[PDB]
Amino acid sequence: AMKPDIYENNREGILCVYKNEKWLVCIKNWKPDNDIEGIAHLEIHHSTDEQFILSAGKAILITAEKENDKFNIELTLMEKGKVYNVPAECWFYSITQKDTKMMYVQDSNCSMDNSDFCDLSKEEIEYIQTNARKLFEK
Amino acid sequence: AMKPDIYENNREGILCVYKNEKWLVCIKNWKPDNDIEGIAHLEIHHSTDEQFILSAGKAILITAEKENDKFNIELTLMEKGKVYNVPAECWFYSITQKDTKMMYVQDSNCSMDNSDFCDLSKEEIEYIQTNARKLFEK
Numbered sequence: 001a002m003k004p005d006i007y008e009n010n011r012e013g014i015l016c017v018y019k020n021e022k023w024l025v026c027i028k029n030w031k032p033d034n035d036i037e038g039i040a041h042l043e044i045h046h047s048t049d050e051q052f053i054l055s056a057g058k059a060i061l062i063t064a065e066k067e068n069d070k071f072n073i074e075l076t077l078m079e080k081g082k083v084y085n086v087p088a089e090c091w092f093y094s095i096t097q098k099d100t101k102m103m104y105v106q107d108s109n110c111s112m113d114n115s116d117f118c119d120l121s122k123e124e125i126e127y128i129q130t131n132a133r134k135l136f137e138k
Numbered sequence: 139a140m141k142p143d144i145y146e147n148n149r150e151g152i153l154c155v156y157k158n159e160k161w162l163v164c165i166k167n168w169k170p171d172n173d174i175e176g177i178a179h180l181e182i183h184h185s186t187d188e189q190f191i192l193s194a195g196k197a198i199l200i201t202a203e204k205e206n207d208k209f210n211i212e213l214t215l216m217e218k219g220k221v222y223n224v225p226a227e228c229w230f231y232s233i234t235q236k237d238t239k240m241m242y243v244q245d246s247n248c249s250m251d252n253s254d255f256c257d258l259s260k261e262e263i264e265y266i267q268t269n270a271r272k273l274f275e276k
Contacts, residue, residue: 001203001210004190004230005223017221018189022160025189025221025243051156051163052142053191053241055219065139072139081193081239083155083163085143092142101219103191105163105243 009101016110024108027055027101034096036136039128040120042071042091047114048107050092051085054078057100060132064091071124077135078102091118095132147239154248162246165193165239172234174274177266178258180209180229185252186245188230189223192216195238198270202229209262215273216240229256233270 007017013031016024032038042064052061059078063086064071071091078084086092094102120128145155151169154162170176180202190199197216201224202209209229216222224230232240258266 001201001212002225002228003212003214004199004201004228005225006214007221007223008219018187018223020187022245023243027219027221049156049158053193055191055193061142063139063142074139074141076141076144081146081165083145083165083241085145085156087140087143090140090142103221105161107160 019108022108023105024110026104028094028104030096030098030100034094036095036129036132039093039095039125041117042093042120043115043117044091045088045106045115047088047109049085049087050104050106051083052078052094053083053103054080055101055103057097058136059097059100059102060095060135061086062093062095062128066091066118071120073124073128075128075131075135077138095128097136157246160246161243162248164242166232166242168234168236168238172232174233174267174270177231177233177263179255180231180258181253181255182229183226183244183253185226185247187223187225188242188244189221190216190232191221191241192218193239193241195235196274197235197238197240198233198273199224200231200233200266204229204256209258211262211266213266213269213273215276233266235274
């Protein structure tokens with residue numbers, strides 16, 4: 001009998017583990033631009049929703065809207081056992097710790113042709129750091 | 139700023155939480171036909187692969203091939219932090235405990251038009267129960 005395919009990621013950051021012509025599934029470990037000290041930019045997908053599932057450790061999901069040239073920011077502490085969805089055209093990013101692991105699901109057309117990054121300002125980074133420090137412990 | 143959509147399942151069995159025209163994401167809790175005592179049939183998807191992610195508790199993924207009228211059975215103890223894929227046309231089912239929670243991803247065309255169930259025989263159920271009892275503790 002055939003076993004299931006079994007996927008893991010022991011590397012920094014993201015490893016895509018399953019892809020077909022419709023969706024993909026990635027396992028994401030800690031990487032510097034998700035560390036509380038390294039938060040510097042948000043991402044946006046113009047053409048796909050994305051779901052996130054926390055597996056190990058703690059994580060916060062930043063979501064934002066861009067108003068003029070400034071972000072209005074929300075922080076959501078992720079809970080193990082829940083699924084989070086960031087709809088297309090919503091800015092987002094993660095804050096994670098060295099032992100954090102999460103999985104995400106999105107459309108398999110993962111060219112950056114249909115996504116973008118944007119830098120956060122200095123006040124925005126400090127604002128996120130101040131509140132995320134606290135939120136990680138709540 | 140918009141929050142992410144936040145999904146949970148506190149009910150028995152399966153709750154589909156995210157769907158689009160390509161994929162869906164479900165959260166599955168314990169239900170009797172996944173209990174070690176309740177294992178009675180396997181499932182097969184003819185047209186979709188499916189990925190499984192363990193969130194809480196313990197779980198075993200049964201995979202099988204059908205040879206004549208009997209199943210050749212494999213058991214895989216799931217690990218938190220890994221992703222498991224059951225390709226289309228592979229028989230499978232889960233064995234879970236009352237506090238188990240997992241998520242799964244498959245094609246959003248989830249009619250049973252393209253899937254089937256098949257009963258396990260008496261020897262097959264006893265065989266799975268004997269080995270799964272042990273495997274849950276390894």
